[PDB]
């Protein structure tokens, strides 16, 4: 729209649409990160629209890479991206940004994370989508019925001279 | 005592380092000022 | 195989002190190559030279292992076809050698079956041991508070009057008794009086059984020898230990007495060549010279060589470059105090003054 | 179509590691700082660096490899190029040497090693933190990406562990977040022992850090040329990622031995010695190295190379020539006092002397709240050192918590610090702090003794790390549940565990409790 | 060797009018094969002790 | 041969950053610039400045860039004169390097003239005789070692002792409010520091790229080769002279760090083939500083206030470089590492500091009398501290203890939190007026404030700040005694 300037005052390209197209054509969500890297290297700072597309890819992508990666997490990847947008690029996440996070929690089954996001959206955004909240509660109940509410290694009781300190 | 023995050691090391350099800088003057080349003289005239 | 430079003839171009320049018509042999002065000269011992530098395509600068007296210019010099060769095998047990690997004990021919070069590259990174292991010395103090590291270096601080000789002999006996490994002692800059005493004592403890089987080799580059010998005797002993480590797969013990005299000897040699000394006055290659020696002492996949080096602190200054550089390669420290000995405690070891790096649950139980 | 090379001359003198070349009359000629190849054998070659072109055409080479096979009278070929080493992602997880050759380990982009540093208008302030995993160094001595942080200490004080562990602490983070923000690592060993390199390599492989780490080794047995050149090659491999919007964690172990190697080469060339026999340009040796580490500007992509040079002092003397020079180049220092290390207080970070000049702006909001107060609590503690006021109690607990062996996950570290800061550990004895921390992190007493009321804030939810990092623990969203679980955990611990531990008199029980504490101290 | 030398001579424009003379030298190292050096350009077709 | 524009020579020796060039028509005059015309696969130009004549045709030179990929018999062409820099008001608001090229990636400078870096210093008849007090806002500097307007100022210090912080504080306090122009010379300093300064100036609008600026920034940093780091100071100083003379404008010249200039000359000297002096510096150490420092002076046309940071290697204030610099300074500020380790910032060592305007004929009589009295007691305390170290405080006379207590309060009082070190200190900076400092220290000597706690003087401003921190400390004691009573 208008001229945007960097730290020292040099202007930056604002045509982020071509890169958003590339992000929307990625299969694995670790490829979207490379596009963002290329954007910065080309002096094209990402904007909110680009981040929403990236968060969508992290949610719609099958995996991080073609080969499995140990301890991979979509939720962790998305939250880090928001931190970059908020605390380093000084761009406030919008409602759409948090909706993707809530969707992943529902899809993954991490109901305890979903609770926190629900409060986050209500506090910052104009509430939380009703369907996601109800779905998150449904996941919690099924775990409660199935006895998976908490990790079970924790429930086993141990005293002073019983803990194995591992 | 520990602070003074530390400086004594640091002073008997700096002393040996800085003295050997002095004597080895003069060795280079007396050696680097030994002009050489191909002397151009009427050597037959001798 | 044979190296092409064996039998190559040259002539002594320049002589200054222990440094001799030899000119070869067909080309100077490779550095570290050994040469013999064939010229008779009416001497009492043969003269061996070691190439250390190349001055030109034909001239090479060498250091003499013996005195260079009565050496005239143009004297014939013949290459030996490689670096100094030292005998290696089970035939060297219970025998005394010099830098050149010659039996100075006057107890008949060695009768070795093989020889190895003094200078050998250190084990590659791929040959390093999979994990650190403890060396059970059989001594309660050492095995408990300052355990030894298989393939590590142990600085045995302490002088005369604390039982250093007996501790050395005990370790030699225990290692063979428990681990079935041999020992090599290297007297670098050793007082010839003390070297004789050790040989007599070892014969009395039967670690050197002349009529039986010995479990220790001796290599003595005493003070009386020129600096060119005191800087290579340690490597010769290390070469002997390497043979047992690799060919036999044992866990050898290499004693070096001292490691400071090795630094001093290599410092004098560098000064003779004219190299500018570094701080304090040691040679600029102080770190490399120790590294080329210590790095060869390690635990490989075949065997191991645990070294017990006696460290001397000049002027009681622990920050001096010599001990300071040495400590960077020591894995353990064993301190002997006269006060402990005077109290009737043997071995006289100060448990609170010793230290070790394998004192960690990740290594020991 | 022949593979013609370019002969320049013949080797003339070999003075240890340095050497000289006599030109062949009327032959092409060589350039400066280029790489020459001495033909040791018709098929094998040895590398050398041009250092001096003389009036008579004689060339001054610094030999690098196969120095034992170099003999006078051998032909020398010229590459005509400055040293370019293989760099990229195909070199990660490998052990190499300064020349780029791979080092076998027991079971195609090229980078120039003579590139200038980024300029004034091509840099930016550090804003992204680089977590070392140690509570002391992340709270009181913040480190940012693009910073040069010295690690100064005496021998065997743990200088390497604090750095190598930092290379390990990034494994978990790199596996979760997008690969763009992953911190690839280079470990340059300069003059260390081959045994140490093998141990470090196997330690990294155990935690699976080789996927994001590469090693560049130059052992002591190697000649000075490789040691003098190792850090330049290491940073060059790191500059590959910096110029592409990614981050690196080049570590040098250690610059002190590099200076010794450079001094050796200068003295063998008979150059005017300076202070402590070091050459006059020893400062420039490290200047051109650490300056190449930077936080590139957004226009240049926003990459970074974080530098962790290591320096060894003698008798805790920080006034040495080399130590002061490096301190005058880096942006901060971590001082590892010998007394603390020998006293059982490890990693023995002397917070009094340590400082970060540019790292405050990188510290995360969550840690910046728990740190500013921790600064005052510890500052008073030092001055005060039996009347035990609140600052003294909290200060003592903090010191106990700083004792670590392995890097701690961000969530675990910050939560423990917050609990101690708010006084939840006041009733806990100092010797039992580690056991309290272990229960808080690994176990969960609230779930154990059927008294759980929280919905999401449980320490077994490792995904909260990125919510704690976004909202700060003192947020309306996470603050309420954080206090509840801490209160329940403290109450249960005091009721069940500490009470029993205070009622142990049997010698066998005493040994049992003593060994429990040791295992907890070594594990969180 | 002559064929290699002639081919190298052809490649060098600056030696267009120069006539190719061949001078034999005994390189002590090489065990089999040969090598050719002309105006700096060096082609090795030799081997050493295996 | 009077004019050498275009004269062609050839490289003959490359020892490093030192290159010999053979001109068959006669070596161009000394200090002449030459360009390596031959393109040898480089990415940057190569300019060599002549430094010696070896014969009628050969000349040794120092390169301002790296000498990589440079072969013998490479074509060199004379530039027809010495290295020159843009000067004028067009330079304002710009970043330059040693060669006068702009590195801010903004646009053409458009200077109306270029002037040579090497120039003759002002003569005796041109020297000025004005003595005023440059009020900095720092208690120790204003009271004991007051700075003189238009006078040389030196900040001697070790590594990580506070040289850069003090300069930034001075820039904030003085330079930003200074009507005249400013030149910031960076010589062998961190490139990040230069980046921060450029951003700081633009925030304060001292460099208004869309308006009018008042600061030039010449930078040759550590990464630069020794040749550049040696001549960067001359280039920056050239601009300052132009402002002083051609415009009669007051100038503030901030040099950081002057020591690297001497170090750079030392590094090249070892290559030029000169026998080293003591320690290893070049034999011309004194001459180089004299030529450079003499040009940094205030003449009858204008005034240049120069503040130079000096680095003391290994904390050896007797080192040839810093030692020779003392004689070229009106004001001296010596920083001590041990003082910093005690939590006292700035770490000024008042006993080792000196000033030229510490004269009643210049400063007020009360200022002189108070400043002398403080130093006298700080000298008494040092002597007493020798007894205190071994035996203890209790082994002193009754009056000696009083001196110790007052001196300790003085030492604590001298500390001050700077507005730039808020991050490190965690406290808001203070700006103490000259009059407040004089009156505040006078009372402490008189004993009027003998009933105030010692730590109430630590990290404060004037006496008003002292008497408020004391109040808070006393009130906080009520939260330690009332709580005690509640506990009891
Ligand atoms: N945080 C720690 N907790 C416990 N032990 C530690 C810690 N850090 C280091 N150590 C141990 O201390 C010893 C020295 O560690 P390290 O090798 O890192 O030291 P260094 O500074 O590299 O010394 P050197 O000069 O030998 O390289 C090792 O046994 C190591 O396991
Ligand atoms: N006035 C001050 N108040 C508080 N801390 C200070 C002050 N001056 C310096 N420091 C501390 O000292 C550190 C180093 O200061 P500074 O950048 O001025 O060093 P220096 O003298 O320029 O040293 P070098 O340039 O060799 O690095 C700062 O990061 C800060 O922690
Ligand atoms: Mg280390
Ligand atoms: Mg500074």
Coordinates of N, CA and C in Angstrom, one line a residue, chain D residues 185 198 321 333-334:
Chain D
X185 N 25.0 -26.1 14.5 CA 26.2 -25.9 15.4 C 27.4 -26.4 14.7
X198 N 37.0 -37.6 20.5 CA 36.3 -38.8 20.3 C 35.2 -38.8 21.4
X321 N 47.8 -11.1 28.2 CA 47.7 -10.4 27.0 C 46.6 -11.0 26.1
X333 N 31.4 -12.0 28.8 CA 32.3 -13.1 29.3 C 31.6 -13.9 30.3
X334 N 31.8 -15.2 30.3 CA 31.4 -16.1 31.3 C 32.6 -16.6 32.0

